[PDB]
Each structure stands twice: as structure tokens, then as C-alpha cells.
Write an enzyme that holds these catalytic residues in place. Structure first.
Site, PDB file in Angstrom:
ATOM      1  N   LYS A 196      -5.973   3.313   9.612  1.00 56.92           N
ATOM      2  CA  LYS A 196      -5.051   4.312   9.102  1.00 56.92           C
ATOM      3  C   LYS A 196      -5.603   5.719   9.252  1.00 56.92           C
ATOM      4  O   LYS A 196      -4.868   6.625   9.654  1.00 56.92           O
ATOM      5  CB  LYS A 196      -4.742   4.013   7.644  1.00 56.92           C
ATOM      6  CG  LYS A 196      -4.029   2.709   7.440  1.00 56.92           C
ATOM      7  CD  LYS A 196      -3.810   2.449   5.978  1.00 56.92           C
ATOM      8  CE  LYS A 196      -3.182   1.102   5.756  1.00 56.92           C
ATOM      9  NZ  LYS A 196      -2.975   0.841   4.318  1.00 56.92           N
TER      10      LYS A 196
ATOM     11  N   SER B 188       0.824  -1.208   0.000  1.00 56.72           N
ATOM     12  CA  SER B 188       0.000   0.000   0.000  1.00 56.72           C
ATOM     13  C   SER B 188       0.843   1.236   0.000  1.00 56.72           C
ATOM     14  O   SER B 188       0.315   2.351   0.039  1.00 56.72           O
ATOM     15  CB  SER B 188      -0.876   0.064   1.232  1.00 56.72           C
ATOM     16  OG  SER B 188      -0.065  -0.105   2.379  1.00 56.72           O
TER      17      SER B 188
HETATM   18  B1  4KZ Z   1      -0.189  -1.429   2.973  1.00 56.20           B
HETATM   19  O1  4KZ Z   1       0.021  -2.606   2.173  1.00 56.20           O
HETATM   20  O2  4KZ Z   1      -1.537  -1.506   3.460  1.00 56.20           O
HETATM   21  C1  4KZ Z   1       0.812  -1.373   4.124  1.00 56.20           C
HETATM   22  C2  4KZ Z   1       2.276  -1.334   3.683  1.00 56.20           C
HETATM   23  C3  4KZ Z   1       3.154  -0.362   4.429  1.00 56.20           C
HETATM   24  C4  4KZ Z   1       2.648   0.869   4.800  1.00 56.20           C
HETATM   25  C5  4KZ Z   1       3.461   1.809   5.443  1.00 56.20           C
HETATM   26  C6  4KZ Z   1       4.783   1.511   5.735  1.00 56.20           C
HETATM   27  C7  4KZ Z   1       5.300   0.275   5.366  1.00 56.20           C
HETATM   28  C8  4KZ Z   1       4.491  -0.650   4.704  1.00 56.20           C
HETATM   29  N1  4KZ Z   1       0.799  -2.574   4.873  1.00 56.20           N
HETATM   30  C9  4KZ Z   1       0.792  -2.475   6.161  1.00 56.20           C
HETATM   31  O3  4KZ Z   1       0.270  -1.617   6.837  1.00 56.20           O
HETATM   32  C10 4KZ Z   1       1.725  -3.409   6.794  1.00 56.20           C
HETATM   33  C11 4KZ Z   1       0.933  -4.551   7.377  1.00 56.20           C
HETATM   34  C12 4KZ Z   1       0.286  -5.311   6.238  1.00 56.20           C
HETATM   35  C13 4KZ Z   1       1.085  -5.901   5.268  1.00 56.20           C
HETATM   36  C14 4KZ Z   1       0.504  -6.611   4.219  1.00 56.20           C
HETATM   37  C15 4KZ Z   1      -0.880  -6.733   4.125  1.00 56.20           C
HETATM   38  C16 4KZ Z   1      -1.687  -6.142   5.088  1.00 56.20           C
HETATM   39  C17 4KZ Z   1      -1.101  -5.431   6.139  1.00 56.20           C
HETATM   40  N2  4KZ Z   1       2.389  -2.731   7.862  1.00 56.20           N
HETATM   41  C18 4KZ Z   1       3.625  -2.987   8.254  1.00 56.20           C
HETATM   42  O4  4KZ Z   1       4.422  -3.673   7.643  1.00 56.20           O
HETATM   43  C19 4KZ Z   1       3.959  -2.447   9.600  1.00 56.20           C
HETATM   44  C20 4KZ Z   1       5.241  -2.518  10.109  1.00 56.20           C
HETATM   45  N3  4KZ Z   1       5.470  -2.028  11.324  1.00 56.20           N
HETATM   46  C21 4KZ Z   1       4.484  -1.485  12.039  1.00 56.20           C
HETATM   47  C22 4KZ Z   1       3.201  -1.423  11.531  1.00 56.20           C
HETATM   48  N4  4KZ Z   1       2.957  -1.915  10.325  1.00 56.20           N
END
Ligand code: 4KZ
Ligand code: 4KZ
Ligand code: AGS
Ligand code: ADP
Lengths: 284, 248, 149, 50, 50, 50
Positions: free
Chosen positions: C126, C83
């Protein structure tokens, strides 16, 4: 088949089972919207749960304030009875785009649409393959590119793109794993359109393996791919010649709506999909 | 006990079982290892409720006024509970015992699950009792034991019925995720036998032998996840998901 | 530098994406315990920016004169997902064009090679995390306006 | 002509076909739903000596 | 030359921005046993000198 | 069971072992969980072909 089962057997059972008896009624477009936007399954049980939800909403709205006779639930009132639509249907494009092509996929829950897209930027002859692609699909891309490197005069490709152009092949979305060899041609159409700056017709879905000398080899699971191409509004298919024995498994009204072209060579595909004039300036 | 037993309530096969201990006279003032089991047996037989129910309010507008002054937020969960209660009151006779989309409350630990059960049971003005199913792995923990043994004990639902004298109370089956199944035993078959409202009216134990009034005994189940409930129990359910709370 | 949004199982989280453009030979380093989907989304954003090199005032040949480095603080916390596409597109375009990016706007969204913004997941955690940290402006995909209710 | 087996995804009608076959030939219908244990010692019972 | 009678710790980002760490107590006690009297520490760890 | 041990088979050492096991079973009292193990073991020794 799901619409007919929900008409005959499921919806009167859920209405009688919920307590309503003829004070509430749905239409057909509402049934097709519930199937397409609240249900992704091979069976029928989730649709039965959704019709139960609609009947229980109607029972609560009867017990708040009653009405007279029959109320016909339309397709607009389904988010008022079920909530936010939790799935998104596949849409077909309409404009010839340069550098992309329309492919067909297959799950154990039904075929989908997939879009190959290729960018050709100035560089030094490097190939990148993103989108969670397996090994068979990467080797299919390499076979398609080697066929195109061997035939640069036939299609108006540049004379030296093997050391002046970086290519990048992407298959959205980037989170679901994708594998198999059945999209050998789609990649050959997309790479040729991206290298020769001429658009590719997005009206037409296609499938089939490719060999290193340009033979279209047969593929598997054709009826699911053709049903998914018909439900998304695509009426033109390119298919291998060796799969014409399997067109007799389709419904008759689906087969009359589709204009199917049967190929053996890859050049028959590239003649049919590419528009004959360039629209963008070249890469290098 | 023959003063106690000829009173209001009990059916007639219960009476044929009730005339058993007239000629079970003398083995308890001296001995015996299985003498108080019959004493206790007819104590259990006259103890369970019969023919006494609490008249129920099923008004959803009173149900909203009960729920909103006991919990904050959870408004969509309240609405799905109201929909289940509305379809419960609307159906009488047929298609009320053919289909019980029994409530399953799913959420993380720390959210209000059991408090919603007490608030639902207080909305219908009926008598709550909670049965936890944490370390339960044997069918005789739900059923009874045979009275021909030394230690014979009926199941937890006989306890839940003898607590409150209503025919149809509200019972909360807490944490059915933790029902552990292995070789030689799982009480999920007894759960389906007592839970589906089309064979529970012919329920029996290994301690008592009479049928029961488990007809409109309202049931609520809670869970932390879905993937550890047995599949023959995952057809008579209707899940409601509680996600977790906002900062405000 | 650009402001992004993440999804943990106990709520949302602000994450900052920062990139640097130093003279070099065209390598791309991706640090901060990133998963494979996130590296592929960064590569897709960089290919989109190499294609449209004149629309945004980017240098004419940065594909072999500039080494880029994409870092997502902090280390020792594994991060994954896709994302994060338009956030990395904003950060890379800001570092190459030497134009500052606004930090009072949160954003989220998946990117493709044509420049299309795809839907995402977990939108309400978010947006609650962005609201209770003091950010009042959100960029979101159009196919996520169903979940704003 | 051997033991018939019905293969497919769940949700597709595979029990209701069985009731249709049973009622078409006026039998009765049961459903064991095996797999609730982890042994071959519940298909065959255990004797009185246990 | 970097002067060696100063012990330091802290996480760096790509903008040149020092971010807080963990285990401040044991690190400062170990630096004080060895005879170092000058510490460089991030600003967000002054709550843990207590 | 003594008749059955005498009729079928046996090798000589297996016969003396089975007879000692039978005498041990005859000394103890029935219904004890010691007795069912010896009864099942002698049931297995008699109905195996020798
Ligand atoms: B996005 O795919 O919805 C998002 C990717 C992201 C956002 C911001 C910064 C780094 C990566 N995904 C996430 O929010 C992920 C969790 C996730 C991953 C795949 C599918 C669904 C959800 N978030 C994280 O990796 C993360 C790491 N550390 C703390 C909080 N979240
Ligand atoms: B083909 O092999 O029939 C096709 C491969 C393919 C090409 C391009 C884009 C997607 C898929 N197969 C599939 O569609 C595969 C199933 C498969 C894989 C290998 C061999 C035979 C069949 N399905 C998918 O990869 C898929 C399906 N749905 C979503 C995402 N990916
Ligand atoms: N929405 C709410 N409004 C008011 N009080 C609440 C709410 N949610 C939880 N509580 C309170 O939180 C406390 C804990 O509730 P519990 O039901 O014990 O949590 P729980 O998640 O059910 O625990 P387990 O281990 O998962 S069974 C009780 O005092 C409740 O009153
Ligand atoms: N082809 C069909 N025609 C009519 N009803 C169907 C059909 N397929 C499924 N159903 C309905 O869907 C329900 C599915 O239940 P079941 O057969 O138990 O599913 P499964 O066999 O997957 O366990 C059945 O009750 C049946 O009424």
C-alpha cells in the site's frame, strides 16, 4: 510449561546443534517474548525453529567478528535477531468505560480476550449485530435484550427503549468468525451499561450463558479462559455457580492469584459490575 | 577395461564387483539381449567420481562479493543464505549430519530462484548441476532399474555425479512441489532416503549395488508453494521466502 | 470523497470511496460489489458518527431525514476487507458536514464503535503504491509502526 | 487392556514419549507413518504374478 | 425528449464522472452498420479508436 | 488343480465351465499375462465353499 521446556530441553539442543557451545546465552524474558510474539501454536515446534534462528544469527555474528567469553541476549535484542514481531499480545484496559464489557473466548490453540461493545443511539427500536457473528450468538443477544426489556425498573433503564432506541452490538475484530453461547452475560452487562449511561468495570472478565428468565447456565472450557485472563493481567472473574467443580484443574499459583465470584442470577452480575451513578446524558 | 578399472579411486567391494566381467567374455560380439548391459555396467562403475574433490572456500565475505554482483536486491534472502552457510562451515563432525535444515526457496514464478542456485554454487567455487523433478512419480526414476531387465537405467543423481568429477558438488532439486503421488508409487520415500544426511551414506541403486559419497553433497530445493510437499519431507527443511519485486 | 489503499497479490492499488447524502428517510445503500466485512465496517463507522453528532457539526437528526449511498468505483470488481474503516468514516463525515476532504492524503485503518483505530495488514504494498502515484502523506494506525522498517 | 492410542495436536511430544517407553523397556523403535498412498493394497503386498 | 440518433456508452460514478469501458471496436462497428453517425464515448477511450 | 476341481463341489454348469477354462489354460504357454488371469480365476473358483 513452554518456558520450562525451552529452558531444559530445547535451547541447549539448538545451541549445540548450531555449533555454538557457551559463547552465547539467552535470558528468561527473551524466551517469554519469543513465545508470546513469534509463536502461536499448541505444540512446541515453532519455538524450536525460533531458537534455531537465534543460534544461527549468533553463529553469523561470531564468524563476522568474534568476541570474548559469553554474550547474554536480552529482550531488547530479539527484534535484532528475529525481525518484526508478527503477533500482538492482548492488553487489559484499566478505566471503567460506558457501553462495553470484557469477555473470554476459547480456541483450540488457547483462550483469548474479547471485548463486547454496544452503542445506543436515538432511533426506532432496531437491533444490529455486526462482527461476523453466528446464529447462536445472535440468539444469545436477543435473549439478553428480552430479559432487560422485562426488568426496566430494577436497573434504571428508560421506560420506552423498545421503540425509541436503536442498538448496535459489535465484537472486534470484524474479520474473524465468532460463535457460541458462552458470552450471554457479557452482552447483558454491555447492553445495560449502554442503556443506563453508567460505566462498567473493565477489571473483571466474565462468562456464562443466560436464559430468558435470568439464570446463568454453565459453560465449557474454563481453564483455558482463566489462564488467558491471568496472563493478560486480570485478577477478578465472574463465573457460573455450576462450574465450581472445574476450578480444581488449574495450577495452584494461578488459582491463588484470582478472585473468583460465583453467580446464579444475572442481577448478581449487574449489581457487581455497574458503577452506581450515571456519567453521560441519556439517549432520548 | 582392466586397464581402466585398476586406476585411482574405487573401494574394494567395488573391486569384487569389478572382477565380474573377466569371465563374462563372449556374449556381446554375437548377441545378446543382455550383453551390453555388463559392458555399460562397468563403464558406469569406472565413470562415477572417486577421491577427487574441489577444495572449498566458506568465507562469508567472499560470498557477499559473489552474490551482490550477480543479483540485485533480495538482500534479506542473501542474509538468510549467509546464515545457513555460516552454520554449515561452523559445524564439523557431530551436529552437521544430525541436522541439515535443507534450504527451500519459495516464491512466485518469475523471481530469481535457479539463478541464486548457480550463484551459490559459484560462490563455493564448486560444480553446479540441476535436476528438475517436474513429472516425477515413480521410485525407479530416482533409483535405478534392475540390470536383469533389458532396459536398465540408473537414477538422475548418478547422472549428476558423472557430469562433474567432484566428490561433493552442488545439486539443485528443482520444483519438488510437482512430485505427483497416487496409488502404486511416489519417490518421496527415496527423496527422504537420499536427502537426510544420516542414511544417504549407505545409499544404493537397483542398477549399481555399491555405497556412495552423498555426504557433503550440498543440496538446494525450490518450490512455488508449501502445501503439496509430503510431511515426512517437511521436517528436514528450512524455508526462505522470496516475495516478488518492487517497481524500481 | 476520500482516498484509500488496497492490496492485490501483485501490488497495491489506489481506491476512491465516494458517498452521497440526499434527502430521504434513513436508508443506507452500499454498491460496488462489496463483501460482508466491508458492509459491516461501513455500518460501524455510521454508528460512531450517529453517537458523536455534536463534535463534528453533523445535523441533529440525519438518522431519519437523509438517505446515504456508499459507492466504491468500479463495478464488476469484487472488493472486500475491513481496512477501509477510517476512509469511509472520513467520506461519510465529509458528506454529512458539507466540508471538503483532502485528496492528497492516503489513509487506511480498521475502525470500531468506540472510535479506536485497529491494525491492518499488507502495509508495504500500500505504501509503495501510494508513493509511485504521487502521494506523500499517509495516515496509518500507531500499532503498524513496527512494519515501517 | 486394548490398543493404546495417543491423541493430540502436533508439536506436543507424541513420538518422544514412544522412544521413552521403548528405551524404558529396552526394545527398539520404528515409525511406519502410514497414509502415503490411497489404497489398502500397500499394507498387504502384491504377489509375484503382477 | 432524448434524441435517438446518438448512440452512447460509458460507466458512471456517484460524483457524475464518466469512466472508460471495454469492447469499443465491436460497439462502434455495430452502431455504424445500423446507420448511426454520432457517438458519445468516454475521454479515456480515445486511445482505442486507432 | 484338475483333482481339486473334481473333488470339491460343484454344480454341473460351473464344473463344465471350470473344465473348459482349465483346458484353455493348458493350451497356452506359461508366464504370459493371459495365463495369470485364468490361474487366479480358477484359484477363486476352487477355494469357495460349494
Ligand atoms: B483492507 O482490509 O486491508 C483492504 C480493504 C479494502 C481497501 C480499499 C478498498 C476496498 C477494500 N483489503 C484489501 O486490500 C482487499 C484485499 C484483501 C481483503 C481482505 C483481506 C486481505 C486483503 N482489496 C480488495 O478487495 C481489492 C479489490 N480490487 C482490487 C484490489 N484490491
Ligand atoms: B463460549 O461458547 O465458550 C465462547 C463464545 C464466544 C463468545 C463471545 C466472543 C467469542 C466467543 N466460545 C468461544 O470462544 C468460541 C468457541 C465455541 C463456539 C461455540 C460453542 C462452544 C465454543 N470461539 C470463538 O468464537 C473465537 C475464538 N477465538 C477467536 C475468535 N472467535
Ligand atoms: N533479482 C533478479 N536479479 C536479476 N535477474 C533476475 C532476478 N530475478 C529474476 N531474474 C532473471 O529472470 C529470469 C528468469 O529467472 P527464473 O529463475 O527462470 O525464474 P523462475 O521464477 O525461477 O521460473 P520458474 O518457472 O518459477 S522455475 C532470469 O534471466 C533471471 O536472471
Ligand atoms: N513435555 C515435553 N518435555 C520435553 N520435550 C518435549 C515435550 N513435548 C515436546 N517436546 C519436544 O518437542 C519435540 C516434538 O517432536 P514430536 O514428539 O515428533 O512432535 P509430534 O509428536 O507432534 O510429531 C520432541 O522432540 C521433544 O523433544
Amino acid at each position: 510449561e513452554k518456558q520450562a521446556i525451552a529452558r531444559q530441553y530445547l535451547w541447549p539442543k539448538q545451541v549445540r546443534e548450531s555449533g555454538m557451545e557457551g559463547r552465547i546465552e539467552v535470558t528468561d524474558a527473551a524466551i517469554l517474548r519469543v513465545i508470546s510474539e513469534y509463536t502461536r501454536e499448541a505444540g512446541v515446534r515453532g519455538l524450536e525453529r525460533e531458537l534455531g534462528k537465534i543460534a544461527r544469527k549468533g553463529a553469523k555474528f561470531w564468524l563476522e567478528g568474534a568476541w570474548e567469553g559469553l554474550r547474554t541476549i536480552d529482550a531488547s535484542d530479539i527484534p535484532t535477531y528475529l525481525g518484526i514481531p508478527r503477533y500482538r499480545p492482548d492488553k487489559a484496559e484499566t478505566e471503567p468505560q460506558v457501553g462495553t464489557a470484557q469477555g473470554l473466548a476459547w480456541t483450540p490453540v488457547g483462550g483469548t480476550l474479547l471485548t463486547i461493545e454496544v452503542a445506543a443511539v436515538p432511533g426506532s427500536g432496531k437491533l444490529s449485530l455486526t462482527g461476523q457473528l453466528g446464529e447462536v450468538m445472535k440468539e444469545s443477544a436477543q435473549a439478553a435484550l428480552t430479559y432487560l426489556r422485562a426488568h426496566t425498573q430494577d436497573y434504571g433503564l428508560p421506560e420506552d427503549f423498545y421503540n425509541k432506541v436503536d442498538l448496535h452490538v459489535h465484537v472486534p475484530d470484524g474479520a474473524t468468525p465468532k460463535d457460541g453461547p458462552s458470552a450471554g452475560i457479557t452482552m447483558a452487562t454491555a447492553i445495560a451499561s449502554a442503556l443506563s449511561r453508567r460505566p462498567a468495570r473493565m477489571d473483571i472478565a466474565m462468562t456464562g450463558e443466560v436464559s430468558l428468565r435470568g439464570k446463568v447456565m454453565p459453560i465449557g472450557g474454563v481453564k483455558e479462559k482463566l489462564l488467558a485472563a491471568h496472563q493478560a493481567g486480570i485478577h477478578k472473574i465472574v463465573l457460573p455457580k455450576d462450574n465450581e467443580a472445574q476450578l480444581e484443574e488449574l495450577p495452584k499459583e494461578v488459582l491463588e492469584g484470582l478472585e473468583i465470584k460465583l453467580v446464579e442470577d444475572v442481577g448478581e452480575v449487574l449489581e457487581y459490575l455497574l458503577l452506581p451513578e450515571p456519567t453521560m446524558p441519556p439517549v432520548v | 577395461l582392466r586397464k581402466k578399472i585398476e586406476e585411482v579411486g574405487m573401494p574394494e567391494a567395488v573391486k569384487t564387483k569389478a572382477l565380474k566381467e573377466l569371465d563374462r567374455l563372449e556374449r556381446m560380439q554375437q548377441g545378446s539381449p543382455e550383453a551390453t548391459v555388463a559392458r555399460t555396467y562397468l563403464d558406469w562403475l569406472t565413470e562415477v567420481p572417486w577421491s577427487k574433490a574441489d577444495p572449498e572456500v566458506l568465507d562469508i565475505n567472499h560470498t557477499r562479493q559473489v552474490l551482490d554482483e550477480d543479483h540485485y536486491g533480495l538482500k534479506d534472502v542473501k542474509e538468510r543464505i549467509l546464515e545457513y552457510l555460516a552454520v554449515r562451515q561452523l559445524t564439523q563432525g557431530l551436529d552437521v549430519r544430525n541436522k541439515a535444515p535443507i534450504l527451500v526457496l519459495v516464491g512466485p514464478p518469475g523471481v530469481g530462484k535457479t539463478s541464486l542456485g548457480r550463484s551459490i554454487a559459484r560462490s563455493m567455487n564448486r560444480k553446479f548441476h540441476r535436476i528438475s523433478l517436474g513429472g516425477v512419480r515413480d521410485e525407479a526414476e530416482i533409483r535405478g532399474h534392475r540390470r536383469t531387465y533389458i532396459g536398465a537405467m540408473p537414477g538422475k543423481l548418478i547422472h549428476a555425479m558423472k557430469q562433474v568429477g567432484v566428490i561433493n558438488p552442488v545439486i539443485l532439486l528443482d520444483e519438488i512441489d510437482k512430485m505427483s503421488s497416487d496409488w502404486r508409487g511416489d519417490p518421496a520415500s527415496a527423496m527422504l532416503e537420499v536427502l537426510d544426511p544420516e542414511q544417504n551414506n549407505t545409499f544404493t541403486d537397483h542398477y549399481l549395488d555399491v555405497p556412495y559419497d552423498l555426504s557433503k553433497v550440498f543440496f538446494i530445493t525450490t518450490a512455488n508453494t508449501l502445501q503439496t510437499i509430503p510431511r515426512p519431507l517437511l521436517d528436514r527443511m528450512e524455508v526462505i521466502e522470496i516475495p516478488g519485486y518492487t517497481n524500481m
